[PDB]
Structure 1
């Protein structure tokens, strides 16, 4: 009946706007930084300077005489067996990918992958089967261990 107000998305005019914004930001940074940067006899004769240098040389000669709280572990607490210790390493993530670092054991992940593969080879709150697609067993460390 009546369309609601929509701003036209121009992919390449937005680039011009971004470039103008970047130029304005650079100019503002230059103006701000020049204030912090623009704040800063013996200059015309040499014999006086050499006398001062010799005096300073004489002066120098005279003076000659453990805690990892908050680090998630992407494994169930029950996965770890008493009586032995085992090593955790960081899971691979992209550098630009802004996300929390998780601690991972390669052997435990291999075991979980094998379990998932076994389950999928034998299986042949709303709409659960496709909830995994749109969207995990981790615990948070506190003052070291938990």
Structure 2
């Protein structure tokens, strides 16, 4: 057709541009620090009367001698998966340090239970959004919920009320 405007992607020129930008920013920071490090005197008068000063200083010092932090944290487990009255320990999920992602809590035992259940389904599954079968491949989804204020997660009451409403509609 009439091909549109295209910027040439040059990796070497890009690296040279970044190097120049970094050098200019470093020079700016150097001069700013020099402005800051100028207003402070660098004295870090005589000899014998200085010893007299020291004697006076010795006299002077002699006279002087005489659950809230867990708000907003995400748990990568279904709420129903927790049995009632059982204390479960949640560990922090492994994340790369060079990865900005919200911290997630996870219990290892629930994880291997979920993996076993998924494999059971996969063996059972012997072979709607548009082409929903590719949602796992495209977007990559464990059930999760977020802790509220005080670390308390109160969401099962809403689901119970929904179930009660559905049953009442059935009745």
TM-score by length of 1: 0.88
Distance 1:133 1:30, change over 3 A: farther
- Name the SS for the 1:82 alignment partner: coil
- Name the SS for the 1:114 alignment partner: helix
Compute the displacement of 1:64 (Å): 1.0
- Name the SS for the 1:53 alignment partner: helix
Residue 130 (structure 2) aligns with: 132
Compute the displacement of 1:145 (Å): 3.4
Bigger mean CA offset, 18-27 vs 56-65? 56-65
Compute the displacement of 1:46 (Å): 0.6
Bigger mean CA offset, 61-70 vs 79-88? 61-70
Tell me if the contact between 1:42 and 1:48 (Cα under 8 Å) persists in the aligned partners.
Answer: no
Distance 1:94 1:75, change over 3 A: same
Bigger mean CA offset, 131-140 vs 15-24? 131-140
Residue 109 (structure 1) aligns with: 111
Compute the displacement of 1:76 (Å): 0.7
**Count, aligned residues:** 142
Instruction: Give the Cα separation in 2 of the matches to 1:34 and 1:102.
Output: 44
Tell me if the contact between 2:72 and 2:151 (Cα under 8 Å) persists in the aligned partners.
Answer: no
Tell me if the contact between 1:88 and 1:104 (Cα under 8 Å) persists in the aligned partners.
Answer: yes
Compute the displacement of 1:120 (Å): 0.6
- Name the SS for the 1:87 alignment partner: strand
Unmatched segments (≥5 aa) in structure 2: 134-141, 153-171
Distance 1:42 1:113, change over 3 A: closer
Compute the displacement of 1:131 (Å): 8.8
Compute the displacement of 1:122 (Å): 1.2
Unmatched segments (≥5 aa) in structure 1: none
Q: Per-residue CA shift, 1:91-116, capped at 9, x if unaligned?
A: 00100011000000000000000000
Compute the displacement of 1:71 (Å): 0.2
